Amino acid sequence: MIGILGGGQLGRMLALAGYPLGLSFRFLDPSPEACAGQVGELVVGEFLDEGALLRFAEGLALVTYEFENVPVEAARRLEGRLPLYPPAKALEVAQDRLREKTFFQGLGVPTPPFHPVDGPEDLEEGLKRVGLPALLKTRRGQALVRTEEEALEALKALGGRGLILEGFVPFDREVSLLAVRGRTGEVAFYPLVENRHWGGILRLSLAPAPGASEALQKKAEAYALRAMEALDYVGVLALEFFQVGEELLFNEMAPRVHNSGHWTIEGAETSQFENHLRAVLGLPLGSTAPRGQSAMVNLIGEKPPFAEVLKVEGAHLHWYGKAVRPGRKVGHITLRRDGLKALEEGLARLSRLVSELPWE
Amino acid sequence: MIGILGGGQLGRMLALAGYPLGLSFRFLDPSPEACAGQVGELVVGEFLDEGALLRFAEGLALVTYEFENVPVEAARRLEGRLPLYPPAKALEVAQDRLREKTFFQGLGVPTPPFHPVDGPEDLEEGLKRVGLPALLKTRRGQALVRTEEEALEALKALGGRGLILEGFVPFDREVSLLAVRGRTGEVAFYPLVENRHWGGILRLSLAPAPGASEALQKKAEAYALRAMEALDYVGVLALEFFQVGEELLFNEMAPRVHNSGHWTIEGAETSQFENHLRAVLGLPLGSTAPRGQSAMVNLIGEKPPFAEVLKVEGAHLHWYGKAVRPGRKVGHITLRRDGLKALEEGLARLSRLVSELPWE
Ligand SMILES: Nc1ncnc2c1ncn2[C@@H]1O[C@H](COP(=O)(O)O)[C@@H](O)[C@H]1O
Ligand SMILES: Nc1ncnc2c1ncn2[C@@H]1O[C@H](COP(=O)(O)O)[C@@H](O)[C@H]1O
Numbered sequence: 058m059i060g061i062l063g064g065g066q067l068g069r070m071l072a073l074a075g076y077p078l079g080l081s082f083r084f085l086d087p088s089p090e091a092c093a094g095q096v097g098e099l100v101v102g103e104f105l106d107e108g109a110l111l112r113f114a115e116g117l118a119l120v121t122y123e124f125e126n127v128p129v130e131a132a133r134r135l136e137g138r139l140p141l142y143p144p145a146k147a148l149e150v151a152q153d154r155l156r157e158k159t160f161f162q163g164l165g166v167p168t169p170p171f172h173p174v175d176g177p178e179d180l181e182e183g184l185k186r187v188g189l190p191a192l193l194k195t196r197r198g199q200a201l202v203r204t205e206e207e208a209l210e211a212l213k214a215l216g217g218r219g220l221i222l223e224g225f226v227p228f229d230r231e232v233s234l235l236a237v238r239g240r241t242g243e244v245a246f247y248p249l250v251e252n253r254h255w256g257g258i259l260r261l262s263l264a265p266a267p268g269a270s271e272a273l274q275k276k277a278e279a280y281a282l283r284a285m286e287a288l289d290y291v292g293v294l295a296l297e298f299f300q301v302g303e304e305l306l307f308n309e310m311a312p313r314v315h316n317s318g319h320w321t322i323e324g325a326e327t328s329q330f331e332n333h334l335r336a337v338l339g340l341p342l343g344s345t346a347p348r349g350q351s352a353m354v355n356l357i358g359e360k361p362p363f364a365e366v367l368k369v370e371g372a373h374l375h376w377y378g379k380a381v382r383p384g385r386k387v388g389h390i391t392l393r394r395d396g397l398k399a400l401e402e403g404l405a406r407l408s409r410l411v412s413e414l415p416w417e
Numbered sequence: 418m419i420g421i422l423g424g425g426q427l428g429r430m431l432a433l434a435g436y437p438l439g440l441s442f443r444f445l446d447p448s449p450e451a452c453a454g455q456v457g458e459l460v461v462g463e464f465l466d467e468g469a470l471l472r473f474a475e476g477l478a479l480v481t482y483e484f485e486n487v488p489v490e491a492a493r494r495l496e497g498r499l500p501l502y503p504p505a506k507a508l509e510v511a512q513d514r515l516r517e518k519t520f521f522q523g524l525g526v527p528t529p530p531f532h533p534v535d536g537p538e539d540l541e542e543g544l545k546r547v548g549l550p551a552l553l554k555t556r557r558g559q560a561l562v563r564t565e566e567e568a569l570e571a572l573k574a575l576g577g578r579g580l581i582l583e584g585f586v587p588f589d590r591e592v593s594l595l596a597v598r599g600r601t602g603e604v605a606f607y608p609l610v611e612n613r614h615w616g617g618i619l620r621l622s623l624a625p626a627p628g629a630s631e632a633l634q635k636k637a638e639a640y641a642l643r644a645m646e647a648l649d650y651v652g653v654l655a656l657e658f659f660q661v662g663e664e665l666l667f668n669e670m671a672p673r674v675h676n677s678g679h680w681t682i683e684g685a686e687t688s689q690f691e692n693h694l695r696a697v698l699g700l701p702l703g704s705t706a707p708r709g710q711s712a713m714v715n716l717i718g719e720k721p722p723f724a725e726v727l728k729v730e731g732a733h734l735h736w737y738g739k740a741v742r743p744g745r746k747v748g749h750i751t752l753r754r755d756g757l758k759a760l761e762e763g764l765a766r767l768s769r770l771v772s773e774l775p776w777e
């Protein structure tokens with residue numbers, strides 16, 4: 058029986074992808090309403106409630122996680138008791154912006170100019186050895202700053218410590234590469250994906266990344282291989298980069314299945330969810346070859362009219378079962394066509410059904 | 418919340434196709450082990466246990482079924498309280514071989530020669546207007562008869578009443594057409610698929626039916642549409658035919674998703690399970706266009722080595738969660754590639770993992 062820290066939609070989808078393989082699941086989440094509960098055994102409890110933690114761990118074959126901000130303490134507490142994939146280290150690295158950048162910077166992968174900022178002297182200490190405008194964000198929320206003074210004003214009423222200074226980067230687009238490494242050591246890579254954000258929320262994902270170079274792919278995969286092996290990664294790893302020209306600058310890493318990959322459920326030969334499961338289980342990884350072209354559109358804080366989205370062919374609706382609320386991810390729609398024209402035509406139909414969707 | 422009579426694997430896959438649509442499920446089944454119980458709330462009770470039957474229906478939005486032989490009594494007993502799709506009549510027709518052939522004969526669809534037999538005088542009465550060899554099947558098991566006396570030497574120890582005489586048919590192959598009709602009245606048709614049985618159990622399904630002509634397909638659909646409209650059918654209907662030449666004879670019908678359609682989970686734009694749900698929900702039906710080519714091989718009373726099947730590309734494993742037992746359907750594997758050559762290469766490698774399959 059697989060145990061999953063986090064009862065969100067990512068966990069809900071891991072379970073749905075696992076039942077066909079005859080697997081079992083148990084989730085842990087502090088909210089009785091976790092949508093994964095509608096699909097498997099859900100244990101309600103705080104991650105730092107040792108009692109709930111150990112109760113949930115009983116009989117488990119292994120433990121993995123879907124909630125990216127899960128307390129690393131809860132993951133390490135169970136690490137001794139049962140197998141845990143990905144390794145707790147990955148959470149550590151991914152949960153601290155500075156620790157994240159240094160790690161990749163140390164692997165030899167490009168990253169925006171960044172500098173640690175704990176004191177006003179640090180802010181200046183690197184405010185120029187970085188640039189301007191730029192971003193100042195908590196290492197563990199964030200604020201873009203243009204004015205040389207708006208910066209020293211930024212740290213104020215933001216914390217004043219434990220922050221990171223990143224040099225704003227004018228990117229052509231944002232892309233991400235979902236990669237996977239089995240318990241056996243085998244690896245696999247999905248086509249790059251173009252992600253579009255708006256209001257600080259992923260709104261649309263285009264796969265494969267439109268135009269993506271053939272060398273661009275190998276480039277991303279290369280960086281990904283380095284990261285996974287460096288961490289003894291097992292499962293699915295999501296790497297987000299900024300694309301400037303033909304360069305890739307590491308932006309963020311998530312030790313788990315990622316939103317920018319939901320299109321793999323029908324748009325790839327093997328979903329990221331099934332592969333994550335195959336990986337942590339020590340089974341042969343499945344093919345990541347794409348099935349035509351996909352457009353992943355998130356459903357944020359609103360419930361589109363089902364009959365209307367289902368009228369579009371190639372459109373695959375996914376409602377998470379969560380209660381609708383402002384800015385909340387309540388589902389997504391994957392449009393899988395076999396020609397960019399058709400794809401672009403269906404996307405037109407769906408854009409009229411979803412708000413705040415930045416597409417033309 | 419959709420309620421399903423029967424907790425078998427068909428119900429289990431129905432629920433899996435539904436969660437992505439934000440649906441809920443409740444199953445009713447005599448066995449506490451119903452594999453559907455692993456994916457939804459399962460009420461353990463006999464279909465003729467009125468107490469359990471009504472307890473099960475509490476609050477359901479509608480009720481459908483997967484148990485091929487659910488007592489039609491239980492289906493009609495709820496038809497009053499809530500919507501029931503497909504209509505109970507389809508269950509009556511499907512459960513009586515004579516009523517089945519009689520029905521389709523009336524629609525004008527070809528059927529092997531058949532004659533009712535409830536006594537020695539009837540056997541002869543039709544045993545001549547049919548011709549040996551032939552099959553003497555019980556209307557509700559069966560026996561192939563060659564000898565003029567092996568016939569009379571069959572009705573006994575087989576009943577003697579409520580049997581039907583069918584004229585043995587030398588078919589090129591067997592094929593089935595899955596059709597769907599929603600409340601709205603809209604309809605859809607999957608590609609005909611080629612089914613190969615052995616030991617009286619479906620062993621392999623090839624989709625789309627190899628070589629099937631555009632005319633054959635159109636005819637099969639014509640019959641299907643007549644049957645569906647004649648029954649005010651709502652949901653997925655599975656029609657099995659015998660292909661002899663360029664014509665096909667109706668052999669059997671099942672008012673539900675069918676085994677010969679499991680390849681549609683990944684081999685068609687919309688699975689038979691999602692379309693069945695879309696139909697009974699009054700939602701726009703989904704495209705039935707095939708995604709390349711598929712081969713559906715059943716897993717009978719044996720658990721293949723998972724690592725071994727996942728080794729082959731394009732292979733999709735589906736373990737039902739049932740306890741392995743002789744003759745029991747415990748899972749299946751859908752292999753879908755985009756070229757007949759590749760398709761045959763895979764089948765070759767899988768055919769070494771599964772016993773009793775008539776391959777090549
Ligand atoms: N260094 C950067 N330069 C420009 N935009 C950025 C930078 N870092 C983050 N963003 C934007 O902020 C959003 C991501 O927020 P976050 O996930 O906390 O990094 C995306 O919409 C990015 O376009
Ligand atoms: N009229 C028929 N002529 C030849 N074979 C038949 C006939 N009816 C049924 N069968 C065979 O019996 C099996 C179907 O069993 P059943 O579904 O109970 O009719 C299949 O493997 C068929 O090949």
Ligand SMILES: [Cl-]
Pocket residue numbers: 064065066090091092093379
């Ligand atoms: Cl949730």
Ligand SMILES: [Cl-]
Pocket residue numbers: 424425426450451452453739
């Ligand atoms: Cl079962």
Ligand SMILES: [Cl-]
Pocket residue numbers: 430433434682688690691
């Ligand atoms: Cl499905």
